[PDB]
Each structure stands twice: as C-alpha cells, then as structure tokens.
Motif scaffolding. Sequence first.
Motif, short mmCIF file in Angstrom:
data_model
loop_
_atom_site.label_atom_id
_atom_site.label_comp_id
_atom_site.label_asym_id
_atom_site.label_seq_id
_atom_site.Cartn_x
_atom_site.Cartn_y
_atom_site.Cartn_z
N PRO A 24 0.82 -1.21 0.00
CA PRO A 24 0.00 0.00 0.00
C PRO A 24 0.84 1.25 0.00
O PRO A 24 1.38 1.66 1.03
CB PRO A 24 -0.80 -0.13 1.29
N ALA A 25 0.96 1.86 -1.18
CA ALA A 25 1.63 3.13 -1.34
C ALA A 25 0.58 4.22 -1.50
O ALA A 25 0.34 4.75 -2.59
CB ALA A 25 2.57 3.08 -2.54
N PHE A 26 -0.06 4.55 -0.39
CA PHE A 26 -1.12 5.54 -0.37
C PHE A 26 -0.65 6.79 0.37
O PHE A 26 -0.02 6.71 1.42
CB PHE A 26 -2.38 5.00 0.29
N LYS A 27 -0.97 7.94 -0.21
CA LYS A 27 -0.73 9.19 0.47
C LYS A 27 -1.68 9.33 1.64
O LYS A 27 -2.79 8.77 1.64
CB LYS A 27 -0.90 10.37 -0.48
N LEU A 28 -1.24 10.06 2.65
CA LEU A 28 -2.08 10.41 3.78
C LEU A 28 -1.94 11.90 4.03
O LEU A 28 -0.83 12.40 4.24
CB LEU A 28 -1.69 9.63 5.03
#
Lengths: 430, 430, 157
Positions: free
Chosen positions: B364-368
């Motif tokens: 999971p390469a998700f921005k936050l």
Amino acid sequence: YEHTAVMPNKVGIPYKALVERPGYAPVHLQIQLVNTRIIPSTNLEYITCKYKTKVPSPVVKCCGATQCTSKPHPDYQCQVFTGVYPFMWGGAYCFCDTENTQMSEAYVERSEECSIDHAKAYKVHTGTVQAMVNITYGSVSWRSADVYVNGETPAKIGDAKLIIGPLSSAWSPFDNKVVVYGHEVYNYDFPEYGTGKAGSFGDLQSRTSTSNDLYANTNLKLQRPQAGIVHTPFTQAPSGFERWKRDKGAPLNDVAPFGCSIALEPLRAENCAVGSIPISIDIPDAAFTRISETPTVSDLECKITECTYASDFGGIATVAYKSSKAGNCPIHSPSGVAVIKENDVTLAESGSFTFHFSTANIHPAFKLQVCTSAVTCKGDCKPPKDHIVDYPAQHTESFTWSWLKVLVGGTSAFIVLGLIATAVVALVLF
Amino acid sequence: YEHTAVMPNKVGIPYKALVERPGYAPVHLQIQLVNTRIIPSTNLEYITCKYKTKVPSPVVKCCGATQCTSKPHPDYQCQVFTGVYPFMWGGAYCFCDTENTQMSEAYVERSEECSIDHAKAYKVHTGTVQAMVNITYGSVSWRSADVYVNGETPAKIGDAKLIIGPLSSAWSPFDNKVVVYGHEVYNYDFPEYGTGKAGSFGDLQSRTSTSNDLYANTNLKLQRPQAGIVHTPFTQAPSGFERWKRDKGAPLNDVAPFGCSIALEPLRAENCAVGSIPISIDIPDAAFTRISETPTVSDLECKITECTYASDFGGIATVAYKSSKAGNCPIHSPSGVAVIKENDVTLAESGSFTFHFSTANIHPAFKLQVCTSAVTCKGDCKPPKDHIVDYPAQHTESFTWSWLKVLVGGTSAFIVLGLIATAVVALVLF
Amino acid sequence: IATLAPEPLVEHKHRTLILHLHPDHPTLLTTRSLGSDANPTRQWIERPTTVNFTVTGEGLEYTWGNHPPKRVWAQESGEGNPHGWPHEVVVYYYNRYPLTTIIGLCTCVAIIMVSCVTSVWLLCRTRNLCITPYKLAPNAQVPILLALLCCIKPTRA
C-alpha cells in the motif's frame, strides 16, 4: 379470420378494411379511431404558485435588544433591528431612542390561489395510449368502446374482440419534464423541487397544496423600517409564478409536433396522428353471412365518371353490377390508393350503382372487391379549387410517368446503345 | 469550496472525503449512503386474486322452459337445462318429468381475500432514487437527512447544502412489467388487464379492489345437475392466483442483480449498490476552521506496523506527528487505495498516534493528508483467515510486480536486443 | 364573461393561407403544422396585419385568440398534371413538389448528362474504332460504313 391489419394512426376517419375469411361471405370494417388519448405515466413533483409574504407582526421592544431565532417556517426571514422611534398613533411610544428595538420576521406561504391557480410540474414517462374506437361493424352497425394499445388487450364491448397496437410511433409529445397550468401544458425543464432560483420559475415549490413544507427561495430580505415608524420592509422577487404567466413559453397544444391536443384531465394528449397501429380483430362468426347467400357479382364492369383528384369523397364510379341473387354486397379497395365512402352497396338483379371515393394518383388503378369480385376501376381524375376546411379522407399520398417511361427507356437507350456498339467492335475486330 | 465528488453507490459504509478549500483548514467528510431506496414511476394496472364462483341460486321452472339472458355480471355464465326431477326435501317437487326446467347461472366475483391477499400488476417506469444520507460532518457531527439523486436538488437539513447524482447506473432492478404480492415482488410479464387466460395468472383481473367491473376468463362452464337433484355444477379452473402461489417464480428480493432489497411500501428497491454518484456539497463556511489555527504537522513520518490485507479496518500505521500547535487534525487518503476508520486525530505537541485502515494492494503506497501535510505510508500487508460476516469497508479492489518488472523488461530485452543486432548489421555492412 | 376577437378573413392560395386580419385588442395568434415537424408560430397581433402560413399537405390549425381553434385541408391547388403542351404545363407537378422536383429534375438532367458522356465515349470511342480497322488500310473496300455515319467519307470503295 382474426383480421390482422396494420392501420394508420389518424383520428377522425374510418378505415373500412375487408374480412376475407375463406369460406363465407366477406364483411367490411369501419374502424374510426375517434380518439388517441394517451395518459403517460407521470408523477406530481411539486406544485408551484406565487408566494404570499404573510408577514407575522414584528416585535418592538422599547429599551434593549430582542434576539431573533430561526423559526422553521418556509424561508423564515427574520432580522433584528435597532435605532427606531416607532410612530404608532400617539407619535412614538417607546421612550428610549436607540435602545428602541424592532424585530422584523417574515416567512413565505402558499397563496390562496396556490390551491386553484397553480403551475404543476411532472416527471413524465411513457404510459399507455387509449381510444373510444367506434366500429359501425358489418351489419352490427355499432360499437363505441374505449380500448387500449398494448398488443394483447381485447375489449369485448359490442360483440367483437379487438386487439390494438402496440403502435410503432412512440413519440410522446410530452417531454420528460413538464409543467402544467390549468389547461396550458408546458414541456418545460422545470428546475426541480427544492432548488428553484428566486424570481425564476419555482421560487415557491410545494409538493402539493396540502403540504405545509415547501421550498421558498424568494430572496426575501427584510430591511429596517424608516424614520421611526411601524412597518415591515420585505424586499422580495415577485414570483416566478407571476412571470411564467406573461414572459412564459407557448403551450404544447400550440407547439407540439405530429398533431396532438391536450387536457388538464388525466393528462392525455388527444388525437396524436402519427404512424401506424397493428390492429387485429376476432369477429363473431355469427355476424358472418355464408358465401352462398350473397349475390355473386362477377361479369361486371367498373369505370369512373367524374374522378376528383382530391380529399373529400369526390371520386365517383359507376359499376355495371352483374349479380346472381339480389341484395347487399360489401365493398372495399384492398389497394390503399382509393378510399371509399360506401362500405356496402345494395343490388337488384344485375343493375348499376355508383359509389363515392377519393384518391391521390392521377391515374387511379385501384382494385375494387365487390363481395368477392375484383375489378380495376382505372381512369383519370381532376384537381379541385376550394381547399380551406378540416382534414382529409384520402390520407394515401404516395408516388404518382408521362415523360419517364419512354424517357428513361430512351435515356437507357443511349447507354444500351453502347454495349451494342461496343462488343460489335469485337465482331468487326473478331 | 463546493466539494464535487464522484462517489460509489454502496450503502453501509462512509466515504470520508476531504475538503481542500484553498485558504482555510481542510475538513473531512463522512458520507454514508445509509439507504438507496428507489421508488420508480409506476401504475396500478390491475389487481388480481382468486375468483369466487358465488353462484346465484338457480331457477327451477317445473313445467316448461325458462330462457336465460346474459346478465352483465363478470363472466356471467348461464345455461338453461331441462330434463330434471329435482329432489328437494320431499323427493322431487316439480310434477312434470321432462318439462322440469333448471336454469343455472354463475358469475365470477372477487374473493374477500382479493381485498387483502392479492397479487398486483404494474407498468414500471424509472422514477427517482432517494437516501437518508447521514453525514456526521466535520465538527458538526450530525445530519441524517432524506435526499434525492437528481443532480440539482439540495437538502438543507442540518447546515450543509448537498447535491447528489444523477447516478450513472440506471439499472432499475424492476423490469418494465412487475407483479407484486404482499412483500414478494415478481418482475413478471403479466399478460395484461382484460386478457388473462383462464388458469394462467390473471384469470381474474380487477382494476382495483373497489372496481366492480373486471375481466374473468376462468373458463367457467356450468354443467347440468345430476339425476334430478338441486345443485349447480360449476366446472372451472382454480385460479391463476392459486397457482402463482405454489408454482410461481422466485422473488426479486431473492433473484435481483446488483444488490437490492424490496418492500410493499412505496415500491422502493433499497440499497442497490451499483456504480457511482457525482455528489457535490456546499459546506457552511462557518464550519470551516481557518488555516492558521490548526497545527501544521509536517516534518513527520508514517509507517505501517501491522497491515492487514483485508476488508475490516485491520491495517494500522503509527505516524510520527511533528506538530506546531496541539489539537485536532482531520485525515484522509486522497488515494482510494486506503480507507481509514478515523476521520480526525488529536495531537499534542508532535507526538504519535496510530490509526486504522484497510487496503487491497500488497504494497500500500497511499498518500495520507494529515490536515495539509502529505505522506506516503508505504509498506506491506498480511492476508487474514476468518471471512464469513457481512460487507466490507475496503471496496477499492484494483490491479495489484515481483515477476513483471524485470520480467517484461527482460521480455522486451530479447526484442530490444533485436534492433541493436539489426542495424548493427548495417554497420558491419556499412 | 370573457374575451373574443373579431373573426378572420380567410383567403385561399396554393398551400398558403393569406389572412387579412384585424383585431380589437392584442391577440396572441398561434398555429401547429400537424406534421411531426411542428413548426409553430406565435405573435401577439394588435395592429391589423395580413399574414401568411405555409400550410402543408396534411393540415394546419389556427387559433384566432380564444375563439376556437380552426383547422384546414390544404392539399394541392396548382393543378397536378393535365397535359396538352410539351412541358410548360409540368409546372403543375413542380408547384405541388417544389422540393423533390428541383432535385428530381436535376436528377433527370443529371442522368441524361451521364447518358450523354457515356454515349459520347461509347460512340466516339466506337466511332474512333471501326475506322481504325478501316481507315488504316486506306483502300479498305467495305460499304458498311453505314453503321456509324459520324466518321465518314469512304474511298469510293
């Protein structure tokens, strides 16, 4: 003998088809689609109408503030105001001079006319079309029954069972979104319940007349009363129901296509003449006459005598009837070229009786089926002079040769002359 | 800041988008489409129900005939009969023996159950879908309002103005023609009012319950009573409402597609999870916090600690918060990869606080976006074990490289090796 | 108790209603050409005005104020196609079809020009031929030149 028949959708004219049952005497039809009232599927989305700023009477606290609250009335506009000196019948009455407070409140409410004089939106689907089809059938001579269009519905009113449609011409003259007003129906893209911009149509938007809740974007803005006097400046757009009555658009019973009329009644669109209807009837076999009882008419002759190339039944033609018995003889032109006023002709022993008709081709070469005896009533017709009255009985316009037959055969003859010049070069060549 | 947002139609899960207003502090959403009740446009076409052959008591003329007439009762079957000797409490009573006449008459009538236990046909159009959308907004923390789908309707319930749809997924799970029964709804091609073959569904066809007129094709055929006794043989098909209750088809709340539930209530089809809805809100600007009052969180760090490659919010990640002030900080992953349980996280002066989430990609390469501070929470996740309970919070499945990157780059390398072998032949060639 | 506008003056023309009109007050007139092409019209009329309406074959309707709606059959009035002249009477057929005859004639004018140039080639080529076999030998004793008679002059043989 279940007489299927494609049939043009057009209201005020019979369609006198002919029952060709093998074995017994044929019988004429007379199918007059007296009405084409439609009644699509719809939904009452919201009534609108012009507002009434039925102001509740403002508060006037004499020395100090009166905070207002946002009461749940529709578009409850309320704004506290200070700096008054309210002249009320004794000069002013509040003894302060700036602490004199005035709280104005005004909400929007349905007019009394909203109940009765009110536009009315709808989301309009397609529904199911109807008709009070008269058939003065055969020798039955009468049935005026209300029917449907969906192609499995009978209506056994009279003695005949009849199945209609579904029609191919699905143009609902109503659009999806419609506004309605009294009798003038407007296929208008009403904005929606709950949204209508103030001044624009649907500034007031009540679900129905009873509905106490509504949507009132009227841009109602109270202003302070002037110079220490009791009143309530309500600054407001006059309604989008006020306009929409004098800057509106025209009604669908005045702008529709393909020939419709309208009512604020079940929301029908009457008499929409467009396309065809595949109609099929199951006659009562009792109404048939057996074939061996009607006169056989063959060895006859037919000819026009004064054919009128027209709409009204101006075309006429004597027929040298050559009967066997004497009696009635139903008639019809199976070709749609000629439309005949007489369904039935009485016959003595081989007399002659003219009928009336109307055509659209200069040389009407239409068959005439005089109770199982065909005949070409070939001839020629004359144009009329006097064309300003309601709608025709002809309704059969098609392609209608004096410089085309040997012309184009002559046109071809040039290029037909080619390949008999060419390939005869091949012979001279060898 | 009118936060447009495409939005998946799915009922029981919030959609915590983020308001990126340039200038003031962002605010999270929590949009849970608690319901998707539909209420298409419809028309009551005809109730049906099982008949009741409520026989009127036959006539018995003792010596000679009694001609019957076709009374207008629905399916008024009546047939005169002779040749009786009717035993009625004293042996026979009519003193003749063949001139004893018996006139049986029977018509069809709605059962008493027709009022209450009755199938119900409909021509069903599309109408307009609804929802009781909860938003526990921002710091408002509550509004549970009923809305529409048509893309100009607001619903100012709470403080926010919200415009929904129109949805792109126009699958009305209702077919055009529908039968309805109590609660089980059948998308059945009911034949029509006025036509239904006896025994088949709709042998009785009443417009409504009150409607005294109907269509009763029951094939009701009276037969003569036997051996000189008073009774009324009525030979009849038991109803197509009798069958249709035990040789029927299954209900649309048990055979529909794309996830719907049903009610005999406004004829809604609840919770139809399919497609997306372009939703747009106008927040109250008062609810915004200005940007200079929330802590700036940058110079932080994020990392998973136990990512669960799953539906329930099993994914977790500490975040080395590096704040300026101390307080709340709304959070969201603008990428749809990660769905987060926490809308908001409290912050001391640069502490650390784990949140929960769920993903669908192994890496999971998700921005936050922690209140205007982006960060990649890269990592790796673990599959669970225990998958038999209701529906997910993840709803983000997409394409999810360990033998593809240098594999296909290696696959290419063979054909990349080609045109550097070829055209180097051109050099060796010259 | 309500309004009514003075009756119109109906005037015939070929598929056209001239209407000299003369109201009492501003009257909203409007119509509906009953084709599936509606082509309606609206205009408040307070000033007396002779107007026009291209009525079609199937019909038009006419609404002189709240006076009831009228209706009108306008079939032909341009006299079809009787015939005793060469072609100037065919205007009757043109005056009934001034959309299809303009193209239908130009079609008829086209195909003859097609049939012209095809006849040009398939005559002049075939006239260029049947002399190339003949007028290249130039004695060429064949008195069956009598098949072209556009390429001409034998050698007395």
